[PDB]
Amino acid sequence: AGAALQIPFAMQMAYRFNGIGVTQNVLYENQKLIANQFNSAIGKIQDSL
Amino acid sequence: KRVDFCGKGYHLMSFPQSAPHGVVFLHVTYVPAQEKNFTTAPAICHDGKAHFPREGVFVSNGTHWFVTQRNFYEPQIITTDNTFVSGNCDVVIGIVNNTVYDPLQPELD
Numbered sequence: 001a002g003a004a005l006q007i008p009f010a011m012q013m014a015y016r017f018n019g020i021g022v023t024q025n026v027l028y029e030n031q032k033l034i035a036n037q038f039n040s041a042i043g044k045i046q047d048s049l
Numbered sequence: 050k051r052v053d054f055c056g057k058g059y060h061l062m063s064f065p066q067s068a069p070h071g072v073v074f075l076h077v078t079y080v081p082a083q084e085k086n087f088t089t090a091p092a093i094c095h096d097g098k099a100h101f102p103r104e105g106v107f108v109s110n111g112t113h114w115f116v117t118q119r120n121f122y123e124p125q126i127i128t129t130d131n132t133f134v135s136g137n138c139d140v141v142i143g144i145v146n147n148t149v150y151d152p153l154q155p156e157l158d
């Protein structure tokens with residue numbers, strides 16, 4: 001919607017969780033679990049393909 | 050609310066006009082500009098507790114910390130009503146020390 005604006009990834013995940021009703025407090029205290037789950041899911045989908 | 054359905058950017062209005070065999074829309078859009086650089090932080094540690102912003106983001110101009118909304122720069126002093134506490138800060142990554150003012154204590158004096 002205009003010019004690109006820099007933003008850290010964690011503060012973008014916080015916004016994206018806040019958008020769907022889950023408060024941003026959940027993300028900043030469960031970051032490693034989310035990262036591990038995402039990596040495992042991407043590995044599984046790569047292997048499935 | 051869907052992005053880029055009608056107009057490039059945030060949507061405000063629309064006006065229909067006729068044509069010989071069709072319709073013409075004059076969308077009205079809002080676009081930000083004249084950006085700046087700033088240093089952020091995800092949470093504030095004070096008195097052993099962690100304060101998070103309600104709807105906004107923490108910023109700092111180098112020597113002081115404010116809270117501002119996402120789409121427009123309007124600094125405000127951090128208080129205990131626009132920030133909410135959640136647990137103790139020992140696991141969050143990116144914590145920075147600071148002080149949070151409250152109105153009740155100076156008010157009572």
Ligand SMILES: *[C@@H]1O[C@H](CO)[C@@H](O[C@@H]2O[C@H](CO)[C@@H](O)[C@H](O)[C@H]2NC(C)=O)[C@H](O)[C@H]1NC(C)=O
Nearest residue numbers: 029030031032033034035036037038039040041
């Ligand atoms: C929520 O679910 C996740 C994943 O199902 C749980 O994390 C697992 O915890 C077990 C036990 O400590 C570990 O062996 C696994 O390696 C963990 N998985 C991952 C991806 O880290 C988590 O404990 C669950 N939380 C609650 C409160 O039930």
Ligand SMILES: *[C@@H]1O[C@H](CO)[C@@H](O[C@@H]2O[C@H](CO)[C@@H](O)[C@H](O)[C@H]2NC(C)=O)[C@H](O)[C@H]1NC(C)=O
Nearest residue numbers: 003004005006007081082083084085086087088
């Ligand atoms: C915020 O700071 C960054 C880095 O100091 C700026 O990025 C540079 O912008 C200049 C503009 O002429 C480019 O020539 C450089 O190549 C940029 N750096 C890099 C690493 O690509 C950025 O422009 C600043 N923000 C604003 C709004 O000016």
Ligand SMILES: *[C@@H]1O[C@H](CO)[C@@H](O[C@@H]2O[C@H](CO)[C@@H](O)[C@H](O)[C@H]2NC(C)=O)[C@H](O)[C@H]1NC(C)=O
Nearest residue numbers: 087108109110111112113114115116124125126
């Ligand atoms: C960051 O912003 C603060 C808040 O305005 C600045 O502190 C004030 O700066 C003005 C001058 O611009 C002084 O007249 C005031 O006395 C300062 N203090 C207060 C409480 O208003 C600060 O100088 C800014 N720092 C930088 C590096 O820009």
Ligand SMILES: *[C@@H]1O[C@H](CO)[C@@H](O[C@@H]2O[C@H](CO)[C@@H](O)[C@H](O)[C@H]2NC(C)=O)[C@H](O)[C@H]1NC(C)=O
Nearest residue numbers: 008009010011089090091092141142143144145
């Ligand atoms: C942002 O990135 C910088 C550099 O990648 C991090 O700074 C490093 O922090 C570690 C410990 O967290 C230190 O051991 C390094 O010496 C630091 N390096 C530099 C160049 O400062 C910083 O911690 C990162 N911040 C967040 C919130 O992740």
Ligand SMILES: *[C@@H]1O[C@H](CO)[C@@H](O[C@@H]2O[C@H](CO)[C@@H](O)[C@H](O)[C@H]2NC(C)=O)[C@H](O)[C@H]1NC(C)=O
Nearest residue numbers: 093094095096097138139142143144145146147
């Ligand atoms: C924020 O403040 C805390 C406590 O005031 C600091 O934690 C102590 O820092 C000193 C010096 O760096 C250490 O000797 C202590 O062991 C630390 N822990 C305690 C319980 O006192 C902390 O370093 C400050 N800065 C940040 C980024 O958290």
